[PDB]
Amino acid sequence: ANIVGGIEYSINNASLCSVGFSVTRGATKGFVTAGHCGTVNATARIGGAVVGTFAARVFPGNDRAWVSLTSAQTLLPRVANGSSFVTVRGSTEAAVGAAVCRSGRTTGYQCGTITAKNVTANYAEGAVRGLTQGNACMGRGDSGGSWITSAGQAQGVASGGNVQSNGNNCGIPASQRSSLFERLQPILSQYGLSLVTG
C-alpha cells in the first residue's frame, strides 16, 4: 500500500492509530509511530491488508516505535493534509513559538505553535518525559500521527493530550490546549532509521 503520514492503520485488528513518517533502515522499509499504539510483533494493517509488524517500541518513559513493512509497500515522503499532501523535506527541529501543524485520521490537518519542550507527562500508564507541547488540537486515534512545520520539516509523532468528553481538545481555546508529541530525531537515531524525504 501507499505509506503516507497521517493515514489510519489498525493494530491486531483491534485498535486504531495514525502513521508518523515513512522511513528506511538499510534495505528495510517502515514507518515511525507512537509506542503506546502497539507492542512488539503486533500486526499492522492499512485498508485491510497486512503491511508489517511492530519491530520495536518504548512506552512509557518515551512514546516511540517503528513498524518494519513488507517489500511490497510504497513509501512516499508525504504527510496527508486533507485531500492534499505536504512534502517531507527534513527533520530540522523548530524552536518554541514556531508554527507547527499535525495530521491524523481523527481531526485531520490542524495548526498551532510549539509552546514548550522537554515536558514530562503523567499518563495513567506511567510518566513519559521529553515530550514537546503544542496548541494545535487533536483527538483519540490521532496518536502516532505526524507533526510537521509549514515548510515540511518533520517534528515528531503525536503522543497524547488533554482531551475533553468529545474525545479531543479542539473544543477548548488554544491557550488551554496541551497536545504532546514525541520528538522525531531521537526515534530515527535510536533505531538507526533514515527519513524518506522529497
Binding site: 524552536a95 498551532g112 488533554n162 482531551v163
Partner: protein, 154 residues
C-alpha cells in the same frame, strides 16, 4: 500552498505576514546556540514571539544584566531565574514523581514565563501544591496552572 490556508485559519498568519514569520523562524534556529553561548550561565532561554500588530520576533532572556546581544534583531529580556536554576527545580519534580499523582497532568520548564509550570486538573491545584512541596522544590520558581480535561494518550 494548501498549507497557507491552515496558517491563516488557526494562526491568523496572513499571506503578507508569511515571509517575515519565516525569516524569524530561520533566525531562531540558526542563532540559538550563538545566543546560548553569549549569555553563558545567565542564559534564561529563547523563543519566537508575536507582537499585537502581527509581526514576529525572536526573544532571548537572561538572569543577569546583558541589556542587549551581539546579534541584531533579538529583543533581550531580563528575568529573575536562570535556565540552570529552573532545570534543577524540574529535576526535583521528575524525581519526586519517580517514586500515584492523581490530579497532576504534567510539568515543564517554561522560559516564556521564567518558571517551571505544573499543570493540574481543574480543582486539583491542591495535589499540585503538595507535589511541589513534597519534592522540596523552591515554590518560588514553580507556577501551578489549571488545565481542562484529562491528560491521556490518544
Amino acid at each position: 500552498p494548501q498549507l497557507k490556508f491552515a496558517m491563516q485559519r488557526d494562526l491568523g498568519i496572513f499571506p503578507t505576514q508569511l515571509p517575515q514569520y519565516l525569516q524569524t523562524e530561520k533566525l531562531a534556529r540558526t542563532q540559538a546556540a550563538a545566543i546560548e553561548r553569549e549569555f553563558g550561565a545567565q542564559f534564561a532561554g529563547s523563543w519566537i514571539e508575536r507582537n499585537e500588530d502581527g509581526s514576529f520576533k525572536l526573544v532571548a532572556a537572561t538572569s543577569g544584566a546583558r541589556k542587549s546581544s551581539t546579534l541584531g534583531g533579538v529583543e533581550v529580556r531580563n528575568v529573575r531565574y536562570s535556565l540552570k536554576q529552573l532545570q534543577s527545580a524540574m529535576e526535583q519534580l521528575d524525581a519526586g514523581a519517580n517514586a500515584p499523582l492523581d490530579g497532576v497532568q504534567s510539568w515543564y520548564v517554561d522560559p516564556r514565563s521564567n518558571a517551571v509550570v505544573v499543570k493540574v486538573d481543574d480543582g486539583a491545584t491542591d495535589a499540585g501544591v503538595d507535589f511541589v512541596a513534597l519534592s522540596g522544590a523552591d515554590s518560588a520558581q514553580v507556577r501551578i496552572e489549571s488545565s481542562p480535561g484529562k491528560l491521556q494518550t490518544t
